[PDB]
Amino acid sequence: KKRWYVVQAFSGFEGRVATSLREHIKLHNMEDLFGEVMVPTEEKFFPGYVLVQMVMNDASWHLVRSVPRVMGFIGGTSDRPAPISDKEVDAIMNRLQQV
Amino acid sequence: GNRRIRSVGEMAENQFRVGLVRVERAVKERLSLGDLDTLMPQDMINAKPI
Amino acid sequence: EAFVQSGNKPEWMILTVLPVLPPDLRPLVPLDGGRFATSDLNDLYRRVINRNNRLKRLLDLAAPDIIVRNEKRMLQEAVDALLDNGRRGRAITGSNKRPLKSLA
Amino acid sequence: ETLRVDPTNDRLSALVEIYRMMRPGEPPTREAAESLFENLFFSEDRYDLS
DNA sequence: CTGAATCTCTTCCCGCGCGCCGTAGGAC
DNA sequence: GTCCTATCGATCTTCGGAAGAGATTCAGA
RNA sequence: ACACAAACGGCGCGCG
């Protein structure tokens, strides 16, 4: 089942990542395995970080890191990205529902 | 016999090639991103790194 | 035996508050007026302080656990570099491509 | 002598193993291993003899 | 608990003279 | 043009050496 | 008011 996963990238160029990854996914189009890649914003909880709704597999794993200047996932190990807690996402989205 | 001499011309060229490699990263992404119907090469490559 | 007999107590070894050198001892000379010469120790402090502040924000926001955990390490990393900058797996360097001079 | 030391047996194991060493603590993938291996010594852009 | 064959952060004469030379990314 | 602003950290020309003692580590005894 | 003045860190080449 799809879950949000955490990645970190270069600040500011984060935004470029925010859309570019989707473009890369549309090029190689293992897209249905993906959800959305999202980062909250303020007038800035995450100023140089990423959230990835996806089911994690190698093919997708490499695709994510394909985009340059993305450091990679956070988790127990590189090949084992950790999902954000369901309660965390549901809380944070509400914390994002207000801005 | 195991040793050879490098001169200005040889060393410079290699240095020049290294700069192109750094262009490669920029141009490839731009080319990947570019619409390509109104973008033109001067946009795709910028002098500064080289 | 030495440790107990001494006035030291191991728990102090873990830093919680940190000292910073008097500024004059870490001068920032105006190499060319406003274009000051690099002053590594200030630079390291700058990194740590910023690294510290950013962690504070997330703690304030109560960011998801995984992110803050990474932040904690990154904080430790900066401090590690500040002291030695080379005892860790990789020394940090600026655009000049020279390893910054740590306190030690 | 080496064959006795060698734990790997098949090309899959070889490709996986070498990738692992080149990519410590990173997810293996058969074609990724091959492509990486290709980069090692079989592409000018990463290995070249004048 | 014995054994080498494995393992990595110390050190590398004393002073002097010029010369050069030091964050990235952007309101268009 | 002047002046403002936020991180700084991946993949590229890398390897260019080597004596000496505390872990951790290979083979049983 | 009877008083300061222009070096921080590297690289190359040479010197006894």
DSSP labels, C43-88: HHHHHHHHHHHHHHHHHHHT--HHHHHHHHHHHHHHHHHHHTSSSS
Nearest nucleotide by C1' from B10 CA?
A: F13
Q: Which chain F positions come under 7 Å from a protein C-beta? A: 6-13
Residue of B nearest to A22 (CA): B33
Closest CA to A59 of A95, A34, A94: A34
- Token match 């797996």: residue? C89
- Inter-chain contact A46–C67, Cβ cutoff 8 Å? yes
Interface partners of B (3+ CB pairs, < 8 Å)? Answer: A
- Asked how this structure was determined, the answer is cryo-EM
User: Which residues in chain A are contacts of B30 at CB distance < 8 A?
Assistant: none
Instruction: Tell me how close the Cα of A77 comes to any Cα of chain D, in angstroms.
Output: 7
User: What's the 3-state SS for C18-41?
Assistant: CCCCCHHHCCCCCCECCECCCCHH
Asked if strand F contacts B47 at the CB level, meaning under 7 A, the answer is: no
DSSP labels, A8-59: EE-TTHHHHHHHHHHHHHHHH--GGGEEEEE--------SS-EEEEE---HH
Question: Is-contact A15 A38, C-beta < 8 A?
Answer: no
CB within 8 Å of A39: residues ≥ 6 apart: A14, A15, A18, A46, A49, A50, A51
d(CA A71, CA B35): 27
DSSP C93: B
Instruction: Tell me how close the Cα of D9 comes to any Cα of chain A, in angstroms.
Output: 24
Using a CB–CB cutoff of 8 Å, tell me whether B33 touches chain A: yes
E strands in chain D: none
d(CA A52, CA A25): 13
Output the distance from C22 CA to G7 C1' rounded to whole Å. 20
Note the residue count of chain A: 99
d(CA A69, CA A39): 16
